[PDB]
Paper text:
The genus Enterovirus within the Picornaviridae, a family of non-enveloped viruses with a positive single-stranded RNA genome, is comprised of more than 100 serotypes. Human enteroviruses (EV) are presently classified into four groups, Enterovirus A-D (EV-A, B, C, and D), among which EV-B, the largest group, consists of over 60 serotypes, including all 6 serotypes of coxsackievirus B (CVB1-6), coxsackievirus A9 (CVA9), over 30 serotypes of echoviruses and more than 20 newly identified enteroviruses. The capsid proteins ([name], [name], and [name]) adopt the classical eight-stranded anti-parallel β-barrel configuration with the N-termini residing inside and the C-termini exposed on the surface.
Here we report the structural characterizations of E30 E-particle, A-particle and mature virion, among which E-particle and mature virion are compact with fully ordered epitopes, showing the potential to be ideal vaccine candidates. Compared to F- and E-particles, the E30 A-particle is markedly expanded with a ~4.5% increase in radius with a maximum diameter of ~345 Å along the fivefold axis. The expansion of the A-particle reflects tectonic movements in the particle, forming perforations at the icosahedral two-fold axes, accompanied by a ~5.5° counterclockwise rotation of the protomeric unit near the threefold axis and a ~7 Å shift away from the two-fold axis of the protomer unit. These conformational changes of individual capsid proteins relay a cascade of alterations, separating the α helices of adjacent [name] subunits and leading to large perforations at the two-fold axes in the A-particle, through which the viral RNA and VP4 might exit.
Author numbering:
A (entry chain B): 12 to 258
B (entry chain C): 1 to 233
C (entry chain C): 1 to 60
D (entry chain C): 1 to 179
E (entry chain A), G (entry chain A): 44 to 284
F (entry chain A): 99 to 195
Amino acid sequence: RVRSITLGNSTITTQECANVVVGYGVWPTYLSDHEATAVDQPTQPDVATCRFYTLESVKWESSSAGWWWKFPEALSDMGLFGQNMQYHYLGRTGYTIHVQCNASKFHQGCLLVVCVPEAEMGAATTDHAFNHTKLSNIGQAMEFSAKKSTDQTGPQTAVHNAGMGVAVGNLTIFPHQWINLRTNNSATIVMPYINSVPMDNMYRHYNFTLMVIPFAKLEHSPQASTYVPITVTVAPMCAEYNGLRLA
Amino acid sequence: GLPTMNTPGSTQFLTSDDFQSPSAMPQFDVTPEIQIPGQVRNLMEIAEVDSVVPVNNTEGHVNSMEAYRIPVRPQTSSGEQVFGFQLQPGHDSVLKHTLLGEILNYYANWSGSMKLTFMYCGAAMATGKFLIAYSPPGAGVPGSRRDAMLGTHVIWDVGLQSSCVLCVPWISQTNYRYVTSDAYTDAGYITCWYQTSIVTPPDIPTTSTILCFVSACNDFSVRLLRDTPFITQ
Amino acid sequence: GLPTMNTPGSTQFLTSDDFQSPSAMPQFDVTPEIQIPGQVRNLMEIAEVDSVVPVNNTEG
Amino acid sequence: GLPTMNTPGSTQFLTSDDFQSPSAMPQFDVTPEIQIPGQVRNLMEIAEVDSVVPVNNTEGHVNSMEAYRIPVRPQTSSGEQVFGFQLQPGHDSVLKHTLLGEILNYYANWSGSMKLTFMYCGAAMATGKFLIAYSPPGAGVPGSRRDAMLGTHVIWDVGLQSSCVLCVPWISQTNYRYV
Amino acid sequence: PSDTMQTRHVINYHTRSESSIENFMGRAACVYIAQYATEKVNDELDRYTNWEITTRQVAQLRRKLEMFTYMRFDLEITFVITSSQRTSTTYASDSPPLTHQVMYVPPGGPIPKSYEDFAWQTSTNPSVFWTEGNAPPRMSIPFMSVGNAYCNFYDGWSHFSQSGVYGYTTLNNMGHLYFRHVNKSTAYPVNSVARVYFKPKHVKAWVPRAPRLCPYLKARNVNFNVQGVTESRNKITLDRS
Amino acid sequence: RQVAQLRRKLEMFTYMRFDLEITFVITSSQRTSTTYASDSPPLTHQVMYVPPGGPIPKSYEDFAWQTSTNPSVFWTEGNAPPRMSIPFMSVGNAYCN
Amino acid sequence: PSDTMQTRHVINYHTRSESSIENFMGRAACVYIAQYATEKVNDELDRYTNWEITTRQVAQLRRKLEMFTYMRFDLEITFVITSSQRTSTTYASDSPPLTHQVMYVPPGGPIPKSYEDFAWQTSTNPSVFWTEGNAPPRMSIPFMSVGNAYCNFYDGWSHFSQSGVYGYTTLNNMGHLYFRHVNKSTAYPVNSVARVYFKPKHVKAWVPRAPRLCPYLKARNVNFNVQGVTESRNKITLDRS
């Protein structure tokens, strides 16, 4: 029923079926080894930096609007992956994202776990430019709101517009997975490297934003647990950076 | 030289022309394309994805997530209606801003089949039956659970399945106006009825939520592309 | 380019012309035709039907 | 005649056109070409020739031959820097007027590899070691001989070789402005 | 006699050719209206005018474009240039035919900063000369990005990590478009209007995105006011048995 | 149904199905002014075909003249007469007289 | 939002077609602007004008040419001729269409020295007659040198050994270009401007030369003021560890 996966260290556990969703039917892979003439030569992490990075868990209460993380910026202080982001200038990588909800049989609700490529967000105070720390901190979960935002230096965090000016119910053409606590508690999304260029600066460009939005709100007896933790575990797969040597 | 004659329509600009153009920039090597994942060659691939329907679109519920949450409450009277809407995805206010609805809005004549998915998001120990009735494009909205049972219906048991999928035929609406006020339609309906109730054990809340999803099937045919009336610059 | 000469009757509109026309609506699928009964390809088929003659055409 | 229609862009002059032209002078025999030595069919053949870099481009050293002469002096402190410049041959003032730099200047987007050759022009009995460090396009200028040794470097021994050749990758700079 | 939408039974033929990317995007749309005059009236209206080629100023085209993250197309530009005289006292003149110059400035090319500038004679700037009364002039621009595709959305910055302008990238530079009269003068001033029409050819798209709900406030941002997800009704249920 | 000689030749059959070839003979003349001395540029005309489902203009300077799904024809005076071609545009299988 | 140059990783395709001699030299460049009038105003502006065909007057073309010692190409000349009226009191007229005559005079042919000269009717002088409002006229000149290639540089004299003019040779005679109106008169005077555009076709080059550092002072010499070999900086070394 259960299966243990190890990537260097440590081991996480998962179920035998788990409904893995590959991004656009494309498994993440390398640049097919046509790296001739030594003018634009790439470099692997060691191999590898491919280990499970677990983030700090969030608390899904009954009034939680949702959360988001911007990648690769949510793994900036994360081991060797966070050091290759400052030792190299250009980089490309793919990801495996696990989102587990540790609920009971007496908790109800539904979550939508989206991976939105190039989730360009709008400002709360329009005509104003926002701070970069109100978009993504170093590993923190930036959260949506139920009301509209009037912040003079932040983004628009109204969840029914999803920060991008669209309808939140239409966020299913992106690679997504439903977590209905009646049926599931986990979600595996495997995202490849999607960009217009084969490599880019990792500190400057957010490739995709992972979004966890509750569509049916969390509802329970008052005698149960009231916070229902959600754990996001990210393993970067097939990372690649620019060559740092001569000739 | 070659004797020629200039036919009518000679030095004109028809905006639907497909003539060869003189290259303003020859001698230029175009950057080659790479394998970017997720190439799409037809907008029916966007309409063939399930998107969440805002069935609870009252005020002020349209400015929340509560528009998507269909309320399931404990019932006093037997056989009450849960929800209901018209099955035209280009004019009905619950379906015109969905994924299928935007694309449909772009085109004037379309015909095909819809695909409604209802998802129960209550507790795992909640048990109940719902009656999802279908009304054909002639007539009409039923008035009771018995009138709904005597037509096309699906009994959705909550205790057995968490989801209910049903494919609806005869969806083709053609509008000859740009914006419609309000252009009488003869589409069908979908209504849901309380067959029994939702039965719960202790220490589980009595209220729950149904989610709705809509898409198309792989036969959907649009025609006569226009501009959408959802932009008013 | 190709050396050409414009013959008389060049930028004119003769109403009996049979030239190719630029399609104002390309990219449009025409509705296909079905078997409608009673197709007629020549107006002699209408004249080849017996019709009643008003021989007693006095007034009133 | 042949029924024709005049498409848009008909009686216009686009300066990038490639149409056949009416010969103003037919009936004229062109003088035949001979074998002139040194035919060139591509301007990359001009950029593929080593030209001398004015590294010592201070004032008033730019109006002399002293711009090309990199000074090697007796040192008091150990591990001092000899010279240094940025590796963009289209914008950097030491490389933009070289042979590679003029051609690069003509084009807006270029990518390839440079080839730096350092030649020691001292006496035959002078012996020394130099450390030629390379910094990748991310970052950055090192601050010491130890920081330079801990990256990509080549130890050039004067007493063994008179020249030092090193090929540098990742040179591609695209500018969207004229000046 | 109006209006009803009807079901109207259809034979099985299943057309889908009008829903391809070529038939969806490839329509001749007016993207810019350029106004310039034979003589200068004011700073606004001057002997010459300009336009940076962007695809974010006409909202009906912008929303059809922004349904995909990455596009790649060739541009077919065509110009409908008309002229009219200003409200003078007398208009009696004998004018020669006006010749217009539409110059395309590539990324990397020099832009004019006035009339009689040297940038109008640059050989690497392709120009089109067209006299009034002829067929409308037409240029063709290829795929002009340094990267492999245009990006309608850029979740990133343009400066030192985390600094600069959010959402702006230089991977969407298509160039500039400069308009002027080649004639030196007229007897009386003449205002001209140049309607610019874009037709994207050989369109390829990647990573489809949700259609935009809110209206547009700026042509360089994705900023928005919050809006309801759909229109409102009175009840979740239906009546009239 | 507005030209009677065409309407009677059409209404001899219940169901028709054809393609349309439209061509325009556009002439211009000045109003009866006091003086006519001017130097005018050539007039450009716009003939827009609005399909069923497309937006119609309700004034001059309307947004419907710039709609990309509305095919227009731009023609300067003195040239050959402009010509459009409309296909069979009915939702059903034939027109009904 | 401006401006940065970036590295921007590129797939291996290695384009070189824009660096060929045909793509480098073969661009339509404006080489001369000819001004002439319907009626004579002064010695400068007269019924007719002339130009000896040289390639040393536009500096952006001259520097791309002078990167090679020996060139050999065919010339494609095209003319953008516009007309405008002078600042008269009244301009009310009914003019017939103006016809222009552009005459190419070969090396060895007779040049006009006035209007109504006999050299405009010479059958060995190819002329082009073009009415205003039509497509721009275009001539094509072949390789016209007596020697086997044009020479951009001539380290020699033109007189008795060591005497004459330094650097001048008759191996670069391409001919003359004469412009006039064919019409006899107008009611009111009309000034015309004829922009001359060169496009070198089938270009072959030999013996590449160093690019010019100094600016140009004369169009027939290689004279120069002395200049620094490059721009100046403050230090030979780098800071900011």
